[PDB]
Ligand binder design. Structure first.
Ligand code: 4N1
Length: 144
């Protein structure tokens, strides 16, 4: 379990630890389905830095059918002035259908993000928007 005090230690490496910590509270307090976890990251330079990431699932209604989408959010050490890179966990029956916002590596582009004024949409906005911008056309789906 991650405590808020500990949360500071976890994102102490970032330059905006206050807004991020405060903002995460909003995300895990309202979206408890998103849990923060500490992870080790290795850069090409060989230098290592401990970064915290949000990992879990988001229930999404679709065609009367609902799927449990597993997603991992990695924050850049310069977050939130830097956009967050997202990765969608694929499976044998779930594939990535490239389209208007999904590439082949699982990158997610969202118009609200390009017009997101800091701090208005906030991370919490990204998740409900994720629930909406993916409901319009699930970039991923289960194929028998
Ligand atoms: S958020 C990715 C993830 C998940 C979902 C998970 O839960 C089933 C476990 C056990 C591990 N990871 C994950 N993927 C990683 C890539 C690199 C890294 O740094 C060493 N840590 C990762 N943890």
């Amino acid at each position: 379990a991650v405590s808020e005090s500990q949360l500071k230690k976890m994102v102490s490496k970032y330059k905006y630890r206050d807004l991020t910590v405060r903002e995460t509270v909003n995300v895990i307090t309202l979206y408890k389905d998103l849990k923060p976890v500490l992870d080790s990251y290795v850069f090409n330079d060989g230098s290592s830095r401990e970064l915290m990431n949000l990992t879990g699932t988001i229930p999404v209604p679709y065609r009367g059918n609902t799927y449990n989408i597993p997603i991992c959010l990695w924050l850049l050490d310069t977050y939130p002035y830097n956009p967050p890179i997202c990765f969608v966990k694929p499976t044998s029956s779930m594939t990535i259908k490239t389209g208007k916002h999904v590439d082949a590596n699982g990158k997610i582009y969202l118009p609200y993000l390009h017009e997101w004024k800091h701090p208005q949409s906030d991370l919490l906005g990204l998740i409900q928007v994720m629930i909406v911008v993916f409901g319009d056309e699930p970039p991923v789906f289960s194929r028998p």
